[PDB]
Amino acid sequence: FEFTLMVVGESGLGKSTLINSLFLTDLYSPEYPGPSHRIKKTVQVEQSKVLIKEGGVQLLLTIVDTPGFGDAVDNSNCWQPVIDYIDSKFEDYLNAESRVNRRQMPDNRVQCCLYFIAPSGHGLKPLDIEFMKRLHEKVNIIPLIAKADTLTPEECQQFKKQIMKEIQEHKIKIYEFPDEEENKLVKKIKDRLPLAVVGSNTIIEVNGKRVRGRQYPWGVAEVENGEHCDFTILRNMLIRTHMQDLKDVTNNVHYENYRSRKLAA
Amino acid sequence: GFDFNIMVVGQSGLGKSTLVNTLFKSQVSRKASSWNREEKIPKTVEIKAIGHVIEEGGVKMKLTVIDTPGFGDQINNENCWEPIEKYINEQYEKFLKEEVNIARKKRIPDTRVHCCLYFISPTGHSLRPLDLEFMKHLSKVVNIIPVIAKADTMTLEEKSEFKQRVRKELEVNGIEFYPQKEFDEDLEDKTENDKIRQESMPFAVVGSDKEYQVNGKRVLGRKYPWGIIEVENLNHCEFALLRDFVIRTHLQDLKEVTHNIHYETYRAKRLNDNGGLPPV
Numbered sequence: 383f384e385f386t387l388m389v390v391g392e393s394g395l396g397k398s399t400l401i402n403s404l405f406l407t408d409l410y411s412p413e414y415p416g417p418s419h420r421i422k423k424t425v426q427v428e429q430s431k432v433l434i435k436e437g438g439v440q441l442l443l444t445i446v447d448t449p450g451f452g453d454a455v456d457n458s459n460c461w462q463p464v465i466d467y468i469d470s471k472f473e474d475y476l477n478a479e480s481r482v483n484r485r486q487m488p489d490n491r492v493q494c495c496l497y498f499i500a501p502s503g504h505g506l507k508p509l510d511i512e513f514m515k516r517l518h519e520k521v522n523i524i525p526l527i528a529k530a531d532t533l534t535p536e537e538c539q540q541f542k543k544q545i546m547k548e549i550q551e552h553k554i555k556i557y558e559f560p561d562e563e564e565n566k567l568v569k570k571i572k573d574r575l576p577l578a579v580v581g582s583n584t585i586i587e588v589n590g591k592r593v594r595g596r597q598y599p600w601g602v603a604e605v606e607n608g609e610h611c612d613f614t615i616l617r618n619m620l621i622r623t624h625m626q627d628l629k630d631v632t633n634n635v636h637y638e639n640y641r642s643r644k645l646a647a
Numbered sequence: 648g649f650d651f652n653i654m655v656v657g658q659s660g661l662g663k664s665t666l667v668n669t670l671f672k673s674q675v676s677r678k679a680s681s682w683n684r685e686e687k688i689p690k691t692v693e694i695k696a697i698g699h700v701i702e703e704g705g706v707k708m709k710l711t712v713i714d715t716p717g718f719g720d721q722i723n724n725e726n727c728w729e730p731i732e733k734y735i736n737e738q739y740e741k742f743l744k745e746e747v748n749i750a751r752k753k754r755i756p757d758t759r760v761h762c763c764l765y766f767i768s769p770t771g772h773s774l775r776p777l778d779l780e781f782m783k784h785l786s787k788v789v790n791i792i793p794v795i796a797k798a799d800t801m802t803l804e805e806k807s808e809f810k811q812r813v814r815k816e817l818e819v820n821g822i823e824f825y826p827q828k829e830f831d832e833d834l835e836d837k838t839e840n841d842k843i844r845q846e847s848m849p850f851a852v853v854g855s856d857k858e859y860q861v862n863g864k865r866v867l868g869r870k871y872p873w874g875i876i877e878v879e880n881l882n883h884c885e886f887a888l889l890r891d892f893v894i895r896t897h898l899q900d901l902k903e904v905t906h907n908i909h910y911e912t913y914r915a916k917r918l919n920d921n922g923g924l925p926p927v
């Protein structure tokens with residue numbers, strides 16, 4: 383069982399911290415640092431495959447990051463390297479379907495893209511709009527309000543209402559979730575979009591119980607507390623539950639639309 | 648009374664207008680009524696100003712806040728510091744034409760920017776090229792005070808590391824930000840301004856418009872489910888350091904450097920333009 387996860391966003395939005403929080407491993411370490419430590423003269427797309435035991439079941443996780451995205455004074459066409467990576471993996475699969483001896487099929491298509499949104503408290507920046515409008519028909523985009531502890535409950539609430547107002551306005555198609563217990567998490571997710579997440583790999587004692595979170599002098603933001611952020615909703619909807627449905631939408635929707643467009647010429 | 652012009656520069660959504668309202672404990676920010684706070688981002692860098700008279704017992708400060716909507720908010724922010732440098736230079740031009748004082752006024756109208764707050768987003772990494780490109784261009788023509796925006800988004804360990812990192816970058820790039828060490832009057836000024844250049848700056852600031860009661864006392868702060876950060880509390884952030892610096896102590900020192908250094912350099916340059924001096 384394999385899975386290809388892509389993270390896109392500015393440096394300093396906690397992307398390296400959230401990835402290591404979702405999978406409880408050191409996927410980004412002094413050996414293979416986060417994308418903010420791998421920035422070059424131009425925007426690059428880099429991948430790293432790693433083996434993960436998720437509760438006694440193995441997982442072949444491939445993280446694809448985009449070091450340098452949004453970090454320059456001129457971010458013109460900084461989304462294009464991401465398009466080239468995703469479409470080249472579609473071409474890699476199409477060339478595998480057209481083989482005479484197509485016994486084994488290498489599937490390296492990007493099945494899910496976490497796009498981090500800077501917590502302005504206002505709305506979406508032109509970079510955010512332009513990225514999601516150029517990749518929503520090529521990958522399953524899951525918008526995240528990065529560093530949710532930046533916003534008070536009231537600010538974060540209307541921040542979400544504004545982001546969805548502009549998603550709907552610009553005709554943006556983010557990944558949506560399709561058993562009535564499976565339809566139980568769908569209703570509790572639609573009312574919380576976009577998910578506001580907090581990341582941390584540090585554990586601290588909060589009234590006896592040891593919780594994973596970020597310690598400020600005035601309080602502790604707890605990562606696995608549904609009343610502080612939406613990290614639990616993200617982890618449950620990504621690994622445990624709808625991972626296969628993300629894989630299926632990639633093959634049946636985005637790859638089929640890439641193929642139907644490629645062969646028409 | 649006297650005039651004072653302060654400019655805030657930074658990406659949209661860094662707490663700029665909220666901080667200005669905290670500095671002056673008044674609704675002096677440009678955004679003041681309902682949906683006017685929820686403002687659209689312009690496609691280019693626009694310069695906007697608003698004026699208020701703040702009275703503090705005979706000290707009628709004529710305050711003008713200048714903000715720069717659209718800075719660092721576009722996909723392509725190339726040369727977005729030039730519209731801000733153009734505004735600063737053209738305020739020198741206004742003063743250059745009015746200090747002759749044909750109107751014979753006790754006080755010449757002053758619209759030059761005396762203090763420019765540049766807000767750095769707390770990324771936990773090194774400075775952004777936009778941050779460097781602005782300061783190395785503008786620190787030569789205005790007084791730039793670098794602040795860390797939204798300081799409540801960092802822990803003590805993160806905040807101490809980010810301050811050292813920004814401070815080392817500014818010293819390495821030859822960015823002479825206010826207070827410039829060249830303009831220390833004596834040893835008493837060097838002593839207080841070394842502590843500010845080397846410890847208190849960049850001011851890790853937090854702004855807030857709302858008040859809460861924390862263990863009996865009314866305090867400004869931001870209310871989270873896990874606790875309330877007190878804005879005027881030096882154990883939580885460094886707003887009070889920024890306030891005692893700009894408002895209580897170095898208010899006039901800011902206007903003096905503006906006049907005797909930046910404006911004078913511009914005035915001496917303008918005398919040699921357009922063919923030079925007129926014959927007399």
Ligand SMILES: Nc1nc2c(ncn2[C@@H]2O[C@H](COP(=O)(O)OP(=O)(O)O)[C@@H](O)[C@H]2O)c(=O)[nH]1
Pocket residue numbers: 392393394395396397398399400416417418528529530531532579580581582596770771772800801805
């Ligand atoms: N307030 C807050 N800070 C965070 C969060 N996640 C990470 N950070 C801090 O942000 C800094 C950089 O985070 P990092 O993961 O390296 O950013 P990125 O990899 O460029 O996306 C670190 O010093 C973290 O302590 C978060 O959820 N909330």
Ligand SMILES: Nc1nc2c(ncn2[C@@H]2O[C@H](COP(=O)(O)OP(=O)(O)O)[C@@H](O)[C@H]2O)c(=O)[nH]1
Pocket residue numbers: 502503504531532533537658659660661662663664665666796797798799800852853854855869
């Ligand atoms: N975390 C945090 N948020 C803040 C702070 N100051 C203001 N905000 C929030 O940031 C959002 C935008 O701030 P705003 O005052 O409009 O700043 P500006 O748009 O950059 O001029 C508002 O919803 C504020 O509630 C702060 O010190 N820390």
